[PDB]
């Protein structure tokens, strides 16, 4: 059954909802409703060279939710442009960390507000090392 997709496609034509790329999913539309209500904010994870893609999380989000926000974004962007789908992040997070402006994000279960990230802010990656 796929009766929900017709109603979805009819809804995306609403000018207040034309921002979303058709395939919305309830979580992303909930994020947009929250940023309308003010408890959601976007954040930019910046590739050191090339481009900078932004992701959106809730105001109560911990590093876990930013982790799954990166999980969601680039995976879609792959076949949005036609890239590589089967991407193994048992590597990526085993080797590369997340870096605030200054500090690096280490405690995975701590909210982004404690580490100081806020709306429109940017984060980056270090290869970790620095012991083991």
């Amino acid at each position: 059954m796929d009766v929900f997709q017709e109603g979805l496609a009819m809804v995306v034509q609403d000018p207040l909802l034309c921002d979303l790329p058709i395939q919305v999913t309830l979580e992303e539309v909930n994020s947009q409703i929250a940023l309308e209500y003010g408890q959601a904010m976007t954040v930019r994870v910046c590739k050191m060279d090339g481009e900078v893609m932004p992701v959106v999380v809730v105001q109560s989000a911990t590093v876990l939710d930013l982790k799954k926000a990166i999980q969601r974004y680039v995976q879609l962007k792959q076949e949005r442009e036609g890239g590589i789908q089967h991407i193994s992040w048992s590597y990526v997070w085993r080797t590369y960390h997340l870096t605030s402006a200054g500090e690096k994000l280490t405690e995975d279960r701590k909210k982004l507000r404690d580490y100081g990230i806020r709306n429109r802010d940017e984060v980056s990656f270090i290869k970790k090392l620095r012991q083991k």
Binding site: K47, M48, D49, W89, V92, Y96, F125
Partner: protein, 155 residues
């Protein structure tokens, strides 16, 4: 003629793997990736480049040697980090051959580069060092592979 068993051998006389990374090397099978596009005989594999040199810096330096058709600087696809090697293609045999002899020792940044042809589709049995094996290596971690250009076989 690549063979991961003798990669750890001082002169190709070893019969037992030097380490587990050779077991991993020969057990695993490799097929060239999707990004491998172009002629292999005219592709130059340049490595040891600084992580902060961009595509134009390589472009001018290796177009000094002839005509380029495509230059790719392999980055980490998720984080942007340059993987410190780049494949450069050359129209006509002239350029690649010249930039094989007068190519090692043309330091580009505060890092000295290494130059070789791309083997992948021309060297039978080539297993890149990510899936164990490979070539070269610093003889300090514990895993090196002789038989190449940086460290040839000590007879």
């Amino acid at each position: 003629e690549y063979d991961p068993l003798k990669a750890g051998s001082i002169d190709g006389t070893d019969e037992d793997p030097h380490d587990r990374a050779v077991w991993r090397a020969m057990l695993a099978r490799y097929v060239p990736n999707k990004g491998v596009i172009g002629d292999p005989l005219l592709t130059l594999f340049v490595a040891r480049l600084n992580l902060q040199t961009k595509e134009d810096k390589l472009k001018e330096v290796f177009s000094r040697y002839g005509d380029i058709r495509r230059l790719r600087l392999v980055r980490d696809l998720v984080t942007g980090f340059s993987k410190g090697y780049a494949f450069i293609e050359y129209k006509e045999e002239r350029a690649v051959i010249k930039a094989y002899r007068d190519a090692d020792g043309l330091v580009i940044d505060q890092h000295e580069i290494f130059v070789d042809y791309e083997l992948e589709r021309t060297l039978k049995g080539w297993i890149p060092r990510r899936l164990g094996g490979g070539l070269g290596g610093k003889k300090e971690s514990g895993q090196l592979r002789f038989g190449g250009r940086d460290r040839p076989f000590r007879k």
